[PDB]
Scaffold this active site. Structure first.
Site, PDB file in Angstrom:
ATOM      1  N   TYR A 249      86.519  73.956 -21.407  1.00 12.95           N
ATOM      2  CA  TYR A 249      85.398  74.178 -20.493  1.00 12.95           C
ATOM      3  C   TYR A 249      85.838  74.726 -19.136  1.00 12.95           C
ATOM      4  CZ  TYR A 249      81.604  73.054 -17.217  1.00 12.95           C
ATOM      5  OH  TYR A 249      80.647  73.111 -16.231  1.00 12.95           O
TER       6      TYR A 249
ATOM      7  N   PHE B 296      83.885  64.640 -10.705  1.00 13.44           N
ATOM      8  CA  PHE B 296      83.161  65.332  -9.635  1.00 13.44           C
ATOM      9  C   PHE B 296      81.950  64.530  -9.150  1.00 13.44           C
ATOM     10  CE2 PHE B 296      82.143  67.263 -13.814  1.00 13.44           C
ATOM     11  CZ  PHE B 296      80.892  66.696 -13.997  1.00 13.44           C
TER      12      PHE B 296
ATOM     13  N   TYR C 285      68.328  33.308  18.660  1.00 13.98           N
ATOM     14  CA  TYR C 285      69.049  33.784  17.474  1.00 13.98           C
ATOM     15  C   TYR C 285      70.035  34.923  17.705  1.00 13.98           C
ATOM     16  CZ  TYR C 285      66.365  30.929  14.165  1.00 13.98           C
ATOM     17  OH  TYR C 285      65.820  29.893  13.458  1.00 13.98           O
TER      18      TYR C 285
END
Lengths: 617, 635, 643
Positions: free
Chosen positions: C72, C353, C304
């Site tokens: 390929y 990839f 907090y």
């Protein structure tokens, strides 16, 4: 005005007894909601029949295939299901779609839809599977053909297979003729059904939120000039004018705005010149939310009153037209828009609730709206305050769009699909939270009314006690005038816990003025201090009892009587049976809010709403 | 390998008899899931290891409160009211409960979640930092083992004061709190305690706050979430191997070196499993044979070829989040933290469920990622252009006019994925400044865990549909091999009967082998369909090459239209390679145990009926049996 | 501790002179950042190490192509076209570059990102799996060291064919590809090659695919993002302690046992740092004195934003540290396809990839960054509001005339604007996967897009840190002035009490008021009879008349004089020490390096009407110092000695 339009929707929901189903008379979201929630409301299919039968026999004359499609589309799974209210609404909408004579469906099949609707019969439908409504609609069709696998509901309990369900209402399983299978499954019935009930609730709750802004103004000690017609004429968004026009009318001649004006006349240069955004900016805030909800109602109703299926049979021109009326993109996108508007309505409510809980922002009211007097064991509406944050946060999350998640579907055939039912489901969920937030808010404002009316009564007691004790102790007119000012000026809730505590605001202001009167009258000095020391002893013995008795008298049971929000207060207090929240009241915040929420859920809240708005325009 | 770890979790969930609560032994997400789903599992609170430290902390708090030590929530007001002071030790605690009983029934938190929250709160107490009485802990054990739990409103927590106040409300015998006893009994709280032999507790110092100041509900849902995440993860990973087998994929994608050279722990470990699952595959033998004929795409599409890379961050997120949730499970989420050893109360924020909240946001994104993989693989399987021989919608037919196969399921998969991706938006980004601006940061962990749970529900649907489709694909592949052999036989015997040359015979046998059977199965002897097209092309080719031969060929074509279609039907009717496949347990489970067959117009069961059976098996946990069978011998 | 690891990253970013790419020694996010930001840092490609396996692979693929082996990309069509075969080796690779040059210039990918991507592609090749020629790799080294990079369009990648095609287009000298040489010159690609002594390459087998088939751009942006994430995280962690000092907090929140009992690795480690920074703090001395006066009228616990910071930071620390590892694994990987196994004579077909690892982790980091932003916004909000300030004036306005001084209100509004957009950005990118490229890429990472959004999120976080640090330096000055102002009020009240001949009962009462009352509530007009000082004095004076009700009529005379003579002296002496201050406890604080850096090295001072500099001018300087890494000097100095 949109206000009078929503009032029309509420009246239509209440007064309708039968829904006329023909291809000419518009079905509204109020009608759909009425059919879904009031079982005494019946479907009336009026013969329209000429068009249907023409179309029906045209398709048949022109030409097993249909039943294979149904088998294929019966692909849902029960995990959760679509409620009977949504299914029957979808059944109504499928029926109405056929009345345009474009579907080629038999008239007898339409009569069956009417018969099943009026007999409380609806199939069990799985919640998920539609990209918008092949799979869900296949269950209506599965019922109509008597699929044993398809389970149908009759009422709230009876669950029987499709053939049995048909037999119990005198009907036989249909053999599907040409195009009928497709005509039953192609459509936007389920998405638009949920959207219909969503839009009715959106309209009612919008008006509710609009109205309750005025009640917030009353209890927060707001300035009513924010709703003045000129401000909004010069920035003329239709929803900005109409919301403020309502608020102006609600706050005119208000006995609470009388108290507000008196409040800001005492120590004016020490108190805020303007209100905070949650009130002052509400008409500007509501403007887009009003328009989104109103414009979406039109869109949803256009869909209700349309032929949503394919092909569109044009029997007059001997033609079958191939298009995509099954695509629910109009509803899907607008459901996304409404969900964002609902989230904006929630933020408005959250912001107002926050201001109401904090003594720094509440202009006299006690923190958490705690009556006390012992604040150590009375934390008031803190729990509800926390819940409001939790509500708003999930609401803002939900308002992310669904139409942005379009997948290329069905062998890449449906490469654009609306996801309309999914989105409408999320908007429905969003409105459920909004119902909770409105409930908590109205419960808080009713509490604030009680606290304001007790505040006026308590200050009156303090003023009277200090007035008579100044006389009894033989204090000079200069001293009397100074101490009476402190009585009026200091917020009662800052010292209610312990009225004669030397470190709390009442005695501080008293001690200060006592020093100032000694310096001003240092012209008999020794006798003055004797008389001032006696004033403190008399106050430490009498004042607490005088304040306690009035509070206890008020709890055993008036500014609200002349207020336009009296219906809301009466409804919550008398009709629902609630009272001032305190440590001496055994009812939990849950129990008080649940009553209000249930009244919002089942539509009972519209009685005091309409009562409140009676005479407007 | 994470694969070993997940199998360990499955075994633990199944085999555990008693959950030991001693403040030393770690409770895992498998233990939490076991208690919630299996009623036979019991809580064993051990006095031997933690009673000593509990009563020391209990006594310390009580004595310091009576002396009047300025400690938050025992002698001071709560939250933003911490400036107020009191000596009314008992009333202060029950005023907090009255205040926090502020939910609204609209929907409920499930019994499973409530009971899991009770276990997690009890576990927090064992550490000896809460100052709760041992008697209250014993009552929590008694309520858990007697199937008693309060009905809790779904919403109200910014993370879990309101939802925990209903557990507290039961313990103190509030009339307004409704409790469950089993499945079909609902009574007020005072009667519920009466039935199990308990008196309503009178709250002592700090006890109210100690009961409500935890992350029990957020972490409870997260625990069942994380167990299911691991189970469904390994399930998706494994089923990528089944997808390869049915789609005719190239197992080269799972090669050790590819992932050795891009060494993401999740990538290596997923590929390792897949390589092992496909090593001696009979379907992969058919794959190599398929691509040897007319050497068709050189590479597989991403849904398979890219699975190890895709699963990598998904594996790691789920594995890491399991640790974080279990750390929360095995922690004292409470405030103040009582240090009796050094004679002081420590003021902090162990009630903050931010570790759970933020990781619930991450896992939902991972679950969405897994769903996209399943949708992509499913999409490929439904399209003939991308399925390498299989029929569209996996329709058996042969008559495609009345068999649309799994098209309904294919549509549903899009709807599932679409809502799934939407759900994976963060909750932790919508922090409001809460509780008189005291709680200007808050985790929203319960809300996030609830949404991740909803995502997992949808993922369960998708796995159920995927496994069903792939079982359909197995039958279709095996039938393909049997149909080709029949066509190959008929052509071979008829060529001999018509006295055709060796050149002619070879060409026609090649066409029978090469042409995908599902393209002409609808009408085998239709002149416009691929078999007869290739036959006619070879028939003209053999004439030119060898130039009554026409007469012998015309007889072949005519005898075929009388013999082929009937023999193809014969082998198909009989039917209405997996034996050597490692996914045999799954096929054997779905086909035999769940009593299903090849989906067609002749099978009257709806896709709903078939996929429901697979979903139910995934929901109740029966699917772990074929999964464990499939993975036998993997190390 | 993660704190040490981040300190190590900063040290490596500062010290490195050459990045050694040898296919064996790993590249960190610090090295990628160094190459991109410090131009004196050079790339050293080592032929001794890996050029053997590269040329073995290069000659393997080239020999196989000429024979006609079915592999390929080298003998086969790309993507969904993987059924088309050919023997035209040179043209096949040119045609791939041709069709991938498909971006549009609206915006662009910055030179920093492009050169980082070049390094990462170069590094990917060193593993000998790509089949690229050594001379191409040598060219990548020379192009980097010469500051030559192609102009690359911002968008196009689903993760990085299109963006990498511009690097490949540069190498083959495509006229349409514009390349920059340094900061000034932009020239066509073939002209850019000649200026560095290079001739346009002619792509042989697989070379065109090898250059485009990577995760180089996504991982490039992610590298500098993850480096910034580590630096800014530690900075945020550190400044929580500076917040404690200025807000008058209880350092108790960072006590080791609290976090041992809830052992999230990020929770323990952040609290550990905070405990160390606040141990024997001079501002914590003032805090203890503050809460000792009227103890039962003040908060027992902090809100907090401070108290819950270790718990909040925990998942944020773990997310940022975990994603650094993931990114660095991608940096040091062969992200190409096919993977050439020359040893066993096989071309392995996979999907390295796929930037899914970097993609998903960028989404998580953005959420963690959003969480960091919320913490800063919460802390900033408390600082601006006097009801939560513990004595500090609203908006941190010095005044004293608050009518013409609204302090840091502008910054307060901006902080909300920053946080709002930041929370919006932290929605995921990975959930928006489309089936792409003829349905071949039915799953794709979208990593570069995701990394771009986390980068945007980090830019906003810098704005917030800049503002937060500036506000706290303002608060430091206000606390130290406050302390000096209380001394003045005490001495003035004390001396006047003696001079007016007041009893010791009175003197002690009035001195308590001078200590107890927050000075910023009456600084505007100290002697105003309606403001909290004279209120407390009037209260105490009357109680003295009662308690001593020995002479009594002369007492009133002396008390009246005390009030009158307070108007003559007090305002003048309070003004004097203020003006004297505008023209100490931070000297003993561990956050002194930060205060010194902002005040004297950047040249700033107390924000008031008397200071001409705008909030913009002061914050800009701090922002620039955070942007270019100068902030690490006062950071490392502050953390000197830790663990």
């Amino acid at each position: 005005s949109h206000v009078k339009d929503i009032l029309g929707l509420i009246n239509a929901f209440n007064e309708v007894k039968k829904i006329t189903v023909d291809g000419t008379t518009p079905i509204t979201v109020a009608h759909v909601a009425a059919l879904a929630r009031r079982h005494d409301v019946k479907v009336a299919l009026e013969a329209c029949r000429a068009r249907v039968e023409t179309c029906s026999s045209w398709v048949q004359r022109k030409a097993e295939l249909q039943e294979s499609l149904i088998r294929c589309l019966l692909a849902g799974v029960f995990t959760d299901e679509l409620p009977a209210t949504a299914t029957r609404s979808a059944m109504l909408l499928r029926l109405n779609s056929f009345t345009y004579g474009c579907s080629g469906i038999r008239w007898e099949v339409m009569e069956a839809l009417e018969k099943l609707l009026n007999s409380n019969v609806s199939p069990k439908v799985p919640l998920r599977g539609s990209v918008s409504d092949l799979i869900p609609l296949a269950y209506i069709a599965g019922l109509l053909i008597g699929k044993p696998s398809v389970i149908a509901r009759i009422g709230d309990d009876v669950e029987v297979p499709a053939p049995e369900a048909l037999s119990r209402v005198g009907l036989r399983p249909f053999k599907l003729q040409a195009k009928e299978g497709l005509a039953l499954v192609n459509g936007t019935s389920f998405a638009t059904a949920v959207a219909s009930t969503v839009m009715y609730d959106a309209n009612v709750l919008l008006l509710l939120v609009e109205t309750l802004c005025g009640m917030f103004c009353e209890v927060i000690f707001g300035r009513e000039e924010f709703a003045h017609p000129l401000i909004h004429k010069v920035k003329p968004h239709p929803g900005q004018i109409e919301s403020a026009e309502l608020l102006e009318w609600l706050l005119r001649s208000s006995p609470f705005q009388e108290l507000s004006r008196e409040y800001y006349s005492i120590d004016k240069l020490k108190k805020p010149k303007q209100d905070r955004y949650a009130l002052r900016s509400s008409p500007q805030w509501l403007a887009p939310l009003v328009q989104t909800i109103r414009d979406a109602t039109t869109t949803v109703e256009t869909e209700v009153n349309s032929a949503n299926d394919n092909p569109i049979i044009d029997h007059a021109n001997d033609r079958a037209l191939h298009g995509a009326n099954f695509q629910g993109s109009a509803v899907g996108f607008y459901m996304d828009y409404v969900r964002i508007a609902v989230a904006g309505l929630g933020k408005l409510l959250f912001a107002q609730f926050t201001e109401l809980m904090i003594e720094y922002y509440s202009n006299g009211l006690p923190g958490n709206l705690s009556l006390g007097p012992d604040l150590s064991v009375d934390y008031g509406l803190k729990g509800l305050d926390i819940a409001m944050a939790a509500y708003s946060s999930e609401l803002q999350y939900l308002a992310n769009p669904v139409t942005t998640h379009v997948h290329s579907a069905e062998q890449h055939n449906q490469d654009i699909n609306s996801l309309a039912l999914i989105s409408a489901r999320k908007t429905e969920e969003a409105l459920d939270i909004l119902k909770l937030m409105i409930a908590s808010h109205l419960t808080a404002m009713c509490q604030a009314v009680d606290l304001r009316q007790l505040e006026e009564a308590l200050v009156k007691v303090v003023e009277n006690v200090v007035s008579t004790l100044a006389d009894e102790c033989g204090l000079p007119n200069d001293t009397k005038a100074r101490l009476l000012y402190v009585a009026k000026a200091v917020p009662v809730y800052t010292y209610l816990e312990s009225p004669c505590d030397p470190t709390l605001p009442l005695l501080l202001g008293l001690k200060q003025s006592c020093f100032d009167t000694i310096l001003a009258l240092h012209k008999e000095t020794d006798t003055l201090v004797d008389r001032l020391a006696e004033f403190e002893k008399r106050l430490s013995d009498r004042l607490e009892n005088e304040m306690t008795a009035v509070r206890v008298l008020y709890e055993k049971k008036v500014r609200i009587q002349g207020s336009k929000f009296l219906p809301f207060y009466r409804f919550v207090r008398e009709e629902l049976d609630t009272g001032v929240m305190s440590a001496r009241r055994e009812q939990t915040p849950q129990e008080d809010v649940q009553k209000v929420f249930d009244a919002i859920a089942d539509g009972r809240i519209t009685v005091p709403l309409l009562h409140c708005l009676q005479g407007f325009l």
